[PDB]
């Protein structure tokens, strides 16, 4: 449903096309990123943070939040600052 | 969930002042999204400040090299020198940047400003 | 005669710091190609040392050192020197001294090379006791991984288990042959039996396979008293080890691999819900004789492994259909099936699902993945 | 070629035919190689073994019984019999026979009824 | 829920803490007695009738009352005393 809605928003036209609306999409499977954009070098081996949608900021996932445990173990005030 | 952080806080031997910190996934995720609604890109910018990544160079002159030089940065906490007491926060900010290319974002005052 | 004390005294009774040590001998770190080829060298050298086998045993009995031989013993002498320098490097890297004298590799080395040292300091070498060296051979999975011949996780455990089975079998046969050529010491070997290294191996086989032909037997008393315990133990180990080999025989990935293109003839791709009735309905209307042009290859595609009678259906339809394993959302998989020259790509969609919309979204997902991979092929999909 | 259709026919086709083929081809090969004699030993120990005793010896080798009435007197024959032991108790003990235990038994009361008149 | 309630009332803060507040509870799993108190050598090997909660009287369980049949087959205590 999320990929379908994002595709519909990016494809549907107006009175101005429909590629200028900003969308942030929540995702649970990182391999599904390649369907969200059409001009990119698709590769399932590539990690999330090197991908065009994540670099543009029009995507997000809960998998990238595992690093915060190690970061907050090493620095005590990081979680409070965040 | 955000309706169980209170239950966790209710434990008798829990001292979040000491450093027992509980990461709430929903709180941080939805906060990232909501703050990105104010300014686009802040979500990915904040998410890339914690993955302990090293600097990688790309010679193709594309956006990969610039964004990778961006992600190479990280953040830390460290006590600062004693020579900066009577001065002002903007003053130490600009002095630190122009001298050793270090920029602050917050200080402990208890309270974080 | 029978100076077994010299071997016993040398083995049983006896129970520039880092200029070259960490430069070459890297086992645990496994850093340098020097250490890599060093482990390769010790493996190949153990193999060559054990290559003597029955053609050594079939040749005349142990005697004094000769001059001309089929193979020069000085190569084995240098092999012993090589093992001795290995023992020295392990002693200087022993860490815990007591665990160093306890460890199996050190004890088996201290069992094997001091006999060759006895051969060095006296020309009275013994042919026996120098064949149970398969402990070094038990692990060639590391060699296979270093040579990238096999790297999957479904073969490493299988090759480990096969290796240790073979090594234990060979060393049991070797000890049995030693017992046979030994005889009773308290009876001054007057009851010894004469058998070459060949027959002991097949005797171990017919004991393991619970046949026991009985053409030749365990005449020696202590030999029989060892086969009783061997039958007690090896059978139990075997019965314990089948349960984690049966699945590795069975779970082997079938219908994998790439596709070989054949020029001058087109081919279509069918992906989606495929089940016996659906593929039957497709086949019986696609390969009907009255439609003359049927010269296309109906390659299939799915994630789960095929089962039931689909394999037999493909078997009787040998030259007309194929099959492959892997999802359609993977660009590597799509490249493997080689749709870059596909004339079209049909899709079969489930029509019996409880939720019609979920399956239809799945079909949309397949279409966007395929069109992202190749943007000009022709797709004929279903809807609900 | 117009055999009665019960799928017991296809079951016996896919089990008993291959089992019999393997059994007699193994028996024939062992007969030929045993009567051939030792190749590099000038053919001295060529035993006077024929097909019937070869079949019986092969069956004794199979299963589990250990009859020593007849056996392989040559090294090559004994080693290759070890190879048949491995091949048999792997393939025809963990690939084929699970189907034969999955067959089980036939129908219980799958008969018919004949209407005896008057009742 | 019962264990959390007991911990919370013990952890209440007053202007003077909740660790001195009289309280008994009720439990259905006798292996869960250890979580009730923290200044104790909570060991799973000890029997229920010996642990600090029962010893102080700040715990109870229905499973204790299964000895009533054996203690009443030899006497008349339940008829009058209890």
Residue numbers in the entry:
A (entry chain C), E (entry chain B): 819 to 833, 871 to 937
B (entry chain C): 462 to 570, 577 to 580
C (entry chain A): 19 to 33, 93 to 461
D (entry chain D): 224 to 342
Give the article text.
To isolate Slo1-containing vesicles from the total cell membrane fraction, cells were first disrupted by sonication into small unilamellar vesicles (SUVs), likely exhibiting both inside-out and outside-out orientations. We then removed nucleic acids using anion exchange chromatography and enriched Slo1-containing vesicles using a resin conjugated to a GFP nanobody. Note that this enrichment captures only vesicles containing Slo1 with an inside-out orientation. We determined the cryoelectron microscopy (cryo-EM) structure of the Slo1 channel in vesicles from the total cell membrane preparation at a resolution of 3.8 Å. The structure exhibited two-fold symmetry, contrasting the four-fold symmetric structures that we previously determined with detergent-solubilized Slo1 in both Ca2+-free and Ca2+-bound conformations. The two-fold symmetric organization is most evident within the cytoplasmic gating ring and is most easily appreciated when viewing the Slo1 channel along its central axis from the intracellular side. At its most intracellular extent, the intersubunit distance for two pairs of diagonally associated protomers differs by more than 10 Å. However, at the level of the inner membrane leaflet, the channel becomes more four-fold symmetric, and near the center of the membrane and selectivity filter, the channel follows four-fold symmetry. Because of the breakdown of four-fold symmetry on the intracellular side of the channel, if the two-fold symmetric channel is superposed onto its four-fold symmetric counterpart by aligning their selectivity filters, one pair of diagonally associated cytoplasmic domains is rotated and resides closer to the membrane than the other. As a point separate from the main aim of the present paper, the symmetry result indicates that while Slo1 adopts predominantly four-fold symmetric structures in the absence or in the presence of high levels of Ca2+ (closed and open, respectively), intermediate levels of Ca2+ favor breakdown of this symmetry.
